[PDB]
Amino acid sequence: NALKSDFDSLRDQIEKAATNAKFNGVSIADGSTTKLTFLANSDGSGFTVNAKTI
Amino acid sequence: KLQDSLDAGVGNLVDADLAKESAKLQSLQTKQQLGVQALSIANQSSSSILSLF
Incomplete structure (x- = not known):
């Protein structure tokens, strides 16, 4: 029972640590969106970074 | 963090x-500094008309 409760605590910890990792409201580790596109060229062409949910 | x-x-x-x-x-x-010297150079225009009379 003690080992199970330790396991459960650690799982809840993983969840908290994962959902708090936002910068400026946008994040690539929670799983909110599928990809983020940044500017890479003075004409609008983008640099694509896929989302890696953890 | x-x-x-x-x-x-x-x-x-x-x-x-x-x-x-x-x-x-x-x-x-x-x-x-250069624009000041340029302005000072441009200012002295029309100063030559006196010599004509």
């Missing part, structure tokens, strides 16, 4: 690069 990251990000957004302003400042001081 998160608070450190947020501070670094805000700084990334709105911080300057002083090395560029130093160069620009030197160039602008030279350019202003």
